[PDB]
Design a protein around this ligand. Sequence first.
Ligand SMILES: CCCCCCCCCCCCCCCC(=O)O
Ligand SMILES: CCCCCCCCCCCCCCCC(=O)O
Ligand SMILES: CCCCCCCCCCCCCCCC(=O)O
Ligand SMILES: CCCCCCCCCCCCCCCC(=O)O
Ligand SMILES: CCCCCCCCCCCCCCCC(=O)O
Ligand SMILES: Oc1ccc(Cl)c2cccnc12
Ligand SMILES: [Cl-]
Ligand SMILES: [Cl-]
Ligand SMILES: [Cl-]
Ligand SMILES: [Cl-]
Ligand SMILES: [Cl-]
Ligand SMILES: [Cl-]
Ligand SMILES: [Cl-]
Ligand SMILES: [Ru+3]
Ligand SMILES: [Ru+3]
Length: 581
Amino acid sequence: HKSEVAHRFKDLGEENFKALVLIAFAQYLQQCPFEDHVKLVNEVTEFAKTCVADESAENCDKSLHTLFGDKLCTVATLRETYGEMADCCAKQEPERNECFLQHKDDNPNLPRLVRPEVDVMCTAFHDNEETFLKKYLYEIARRHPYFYAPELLFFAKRYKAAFTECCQAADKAACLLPKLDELRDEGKASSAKQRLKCASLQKFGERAFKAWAVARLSQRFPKAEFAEVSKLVTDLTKVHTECCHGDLLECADDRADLAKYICENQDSISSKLKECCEKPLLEKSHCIAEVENDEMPADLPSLAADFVESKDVCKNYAEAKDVFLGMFLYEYARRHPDYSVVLLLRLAKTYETTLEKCCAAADPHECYAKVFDEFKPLVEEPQNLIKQNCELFEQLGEYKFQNALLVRYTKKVPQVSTPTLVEVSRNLGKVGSKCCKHPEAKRMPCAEDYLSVVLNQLCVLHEKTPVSDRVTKCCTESLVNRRPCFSALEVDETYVPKEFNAETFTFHADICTLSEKERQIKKQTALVELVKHKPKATKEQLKAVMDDFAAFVEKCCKADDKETCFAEEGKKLVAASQAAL
Ligand SMILES: CCCCCCCCCCCCCCCC(=O)O
Ligand SMILES: CCCCCCCCCCCCCCCC(=O)O
Ligand SMILES: CCCCCCCCCCCCCCCC(=O)O
Ligand SMILES: CCCCCCCCCCCCCCCC(=O)O
Ligand SMILES: CCCCCCCCCCCCCCCC(=O)O
Ligand SMILES: Oc1ccc(Cl)c2cccnc12
Ligand SMILES: [Cl-]
Ligand SMILES: [Cl-]
Ligand SMILES: [Cl-]
Ligand SMILES: [Cl-]
Ligand SMILES: [Cl-]
Ligand SMILES: [Cl-]
Ligand SMILES: [Cl-]
Ligand SMILES: [Ru+3]
Ligand SMILES: [Ru+3]
């Protein structure tokens, strides 16, 4: 293209162009104030307008990396605010762009964004929809300089949807805050999810990533030929490789190219893409990333003929080990959208170990002709765990199910800080709430999707402050054994009971005057501490004081006097509890 900026401006449109320019600059100049970014956007935007009017116009033939880097090196305060980053301006492309890339600062030190009151928010939204919305877009991008820009744009449009609706409703806050809590959860999860793929790719290498992609792409497009899945796995591996490196434009072009290939070859891939493929370039690769699985072809054969009977197993394996294993993964995954990806990786690795053991032995076929028996226990384990836990979740509430998780995980690893124990148990409990309302045909992918983002981010929090050798051993091992390792943790019988502290189990009337959530957290915080102080307490014994405490609060949080019921009756509850434990 004669002018890449004019071309982008025509592909995306003025509104999307401006928003992505803002995110781009907010992710590099993370301490410049919001109003100078607006100046940069308006300046880049009306320059781009000269380029769509005339592509021979001055500077319109420069590359976007050049144009972007040029804009960065005109910030007058660049060396005084970003210091060493300003020295990038003395290099030339592509060294300069790489130098700027290196100087992206993850985890900068900005105050946390405090959600204001609903009436404050709706009033700001009404008084200046754009400035309000773009300011929050800027606040989030500067605090997440590696969050892929278009997805951030796609979250911004969903926030706009939440405000327009709820700022008009009768009970504003009742409409808005759940939507805002929901959006925060996904954006935080997506941020965690991107950094996990990009950190297992280097921890574990291209091969393991390719193995994961074959499984995932085969469940999604089970009518595609394995040659087509392998083509897609290759392009997709390059795409995540390049996107992990951090160049937003080089990353965006790889994604857009892959989506153009997929949309051009739908009838070799899937019948579900005609709408996504009709969508504009900015949304094309996103839409297809989250499209639902295509229907499996009717009455596929068993995997027996190709992978256990056929005399050419060991010979076809040796001819190309990974391609043969990759074919096995393809055939198993396409038949099993109900499995998690990691389970399919367990099976494939299981098939790999026995093929490696039997293809070197006398009469291989005898040695390995039963390996499909080895798959059954590996399949029951995730399913069993889902059943019992989804069963328990509908026996108890969401909140009481959290309290069940709370007791169990505290007993397994009582060294974890109380607040971290509460947050994980509350979150896991949320995962029963959404995943357990799926049928068994789609429960295991649901759990995997959510556990993975609860598991390694408790592991990144654990590498921050290690407290147990067993949770580092879980967290530093394969992503296929991550969830089993944690499931295999047993009640810590090394632990020394925490010394009784009276202030930890003293309660006041403020507890009546707190929100349901904030009341549950403090109820759940005391429960962790109770299990830490008397860890040999049984759930029968624990239920008895939990019932007592429940009655205690409902008594003192309703009497004529309150501040004194909580100390007088409170003193009784404690003493009666210590006696029973
Ligand atoms: C002057 C600064 C350089 C130009 C700034 C352009 C901002 C980046 C363009 C984003 C392209 C988005 C393409 C979406 C397609 C996809 O993700 O598959
Ligand atoms: C078919 C194209 C890609 C070929 C490369 C993928 C071969 C699959 C290998 C499966 C090995 C076991 C599964 C991964 C386990 C792990 O990474 O810990
Ligand atoms: C879906 C229920 C989850 C309830 C809260 C989490 C605690 C139990 C999780 C058990 C299910 C594990 C399945 C993960 C998939 C896999 O690792 O193959
Ligand atoms: C910072 C370290 C915190 C670790 C605290 C232990 C919490 C373990 C919960 C992880 C999920 C376990 C696997 C699924 C359910 C199970 O089988 O227990
Ligand atoms: C053993 C010495 C201290 C005395 C014990 C008092 C603190 C008990 C722990 C509170 C658990 C509250 C959770 C149950 C109530 C509910 O779910 O609403
Ligand atoms: O930390 C975050 C990452 C991504 C997104 Cl979209 C967020 C939205 C609101 C608050 N925090 C967020
Ligand atoms: Cl936040
Ligand atoms: Cl907010
Ligand atoms: Cl604002
Ligand atoms: Cl604000
Ligand atoms: Cl804001
Ligand atoms: Cl944030
Ligand atoms: Cl967040
Ligand atoms: Ru704001
Ligand atoms: Ru955030």
